[PDB]
Amino acid sequence: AWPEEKNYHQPAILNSSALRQIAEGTSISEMWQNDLQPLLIERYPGSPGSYAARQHIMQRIQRLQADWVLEIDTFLSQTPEGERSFSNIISTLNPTAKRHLVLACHYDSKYFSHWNNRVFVGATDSAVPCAMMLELARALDKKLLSLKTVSDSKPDLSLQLIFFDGEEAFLHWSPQDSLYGSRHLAAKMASTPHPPGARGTSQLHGMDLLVLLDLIGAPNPTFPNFFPNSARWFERLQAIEHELHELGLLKDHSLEGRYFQNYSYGGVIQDDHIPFLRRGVPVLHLIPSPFPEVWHTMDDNEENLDESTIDNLNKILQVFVLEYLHL
Numbered sequence: 001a002w003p004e005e006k007n008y009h010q011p012a013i014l015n016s017s018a019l020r021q022i023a024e025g026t027s028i029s030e031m032w033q034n035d036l037q038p039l040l041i042e043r044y045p046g047s048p049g050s051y052a053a054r055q056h057i058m059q060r061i062q063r064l065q066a067d068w069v070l071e072i073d074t075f076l077s078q079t080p081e082g083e084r085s086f087s088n089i090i091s092t093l094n095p096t097a098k099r100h101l102v103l104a105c106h107y108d109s110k111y112f113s114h115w116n117n118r119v120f121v122g123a124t125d126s127a128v129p130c131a132m133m134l135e136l137a138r139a140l141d142k143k144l145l146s147l148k149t150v151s152d153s154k155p156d157l158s159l160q161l162i163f164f165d166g167e168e169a170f171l172h173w174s175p176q177d178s179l180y181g182s183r184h185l186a187a188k189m190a191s192t193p194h195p196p197g198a199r200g201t202s203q204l205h206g207m208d209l210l211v212l213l214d215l216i217g218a219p220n221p222t223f224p225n226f227f228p229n230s231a232r233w234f235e236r237l238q239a240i241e242h243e244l245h246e247l248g249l250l251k252d253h254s255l256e257g258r259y260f261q262n263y264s265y266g267g268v269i270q271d272d273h274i275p276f277l278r279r280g281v282p283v284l285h286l287i288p289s290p291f292p293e294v295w296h297t298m299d300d301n302e303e304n305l306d307e308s309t310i311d312n313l314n315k316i317l318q319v320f321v322l323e324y325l326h327l
């Protein structure tokens with residue numbers, strides 16, 4: 001019965017004053033300095049930056065008041081370069097709650113040989129998504145702390161963050177050389193009872209919706225509404241964007257240049273959501289089409305990021321998450 005609850009779940013929509021509070025509650029400059037910059041480093045699996053990125057992400061979550069439970073999902077896999085260790089970071093509020101809304105991105109960076117003394121740091125791909133998730137945890141900390149309180153008056157639902165390792169191919173993208181962390185974690189969750197002691201249901205049944213952020217940070221992104229089974233949630237993002245715009249709460253933003261689009265997409269994008277989608281998890285895939293102009297080039301750097309765009313998207317995402325969780 002409970003695994004169907006997601007199908008009927010409704011947002012608790014925020015009023016104008018709440019929207020203004022949320023818009024003012026997030027700081028793009030603080031995210032930039034404290035959450036984003038430490039990640040703008042080479043961080044392919046096993047590199048010093050991989051370890052540093054992991055420490056940084058964990059550290060930033062630990063300093064918060066909300067009752068986050070951190071779990072490092074570490075495993076080995078063969079790769080074109082030989083065996084490597086990969087570590088997914090999972091951060092969960094109320095780990096025994098039957099349902100979670102799940103926000104995710106990948107924290108590894110793709111390996112490139114150094115080019116004119118330049119290194120690939122994957123600013124949009126996906127350092128910015130990581131930082132947006134960390135800034136969301138910080139900005140909403142007091143609201144999220146309320147989830148620590150037990151009540152029959154609300155659904156058994158909370159929030160999880162996943163930072164996937166090993167999303168990127170080491171060489172040429174193949175089913176075997178990509179998605180190392182997400183293929184591993186989806187298989188693990190599929191085979192794990194949830195809630196503990198349950199018959200039938202797995203941790204995948206507990207995932208209300210996977211909201212996967214990827215390739216965010218370029219100016220004027222356009223996100224297609226990819227999947228019918230999450231289209232109603234996508235439409236909430238459009239509505240939040242529109243209302244925030246109308247309230248004067250977005251920066252350098254026009255209705256003509258809005259981010260969340262009516263149209264869908266005519267191909268199939270491979271990303272960390274694939275192992276989840278194929279097992280039936282609803283996915284809201286916040287990846288733009290087209291990809292950023294700088295995609296997989298040395299120009300995917302801090303210079304080419306757009307502050308206002310990320311700030312706007314932070315506001316929209318934070319409203320979405322609060323409305324989903326009825327906070």
Ligand SMILES: [Zn+2]
Pocket residue numbers: 110125168296
């Ligand atoms: Zn990439």
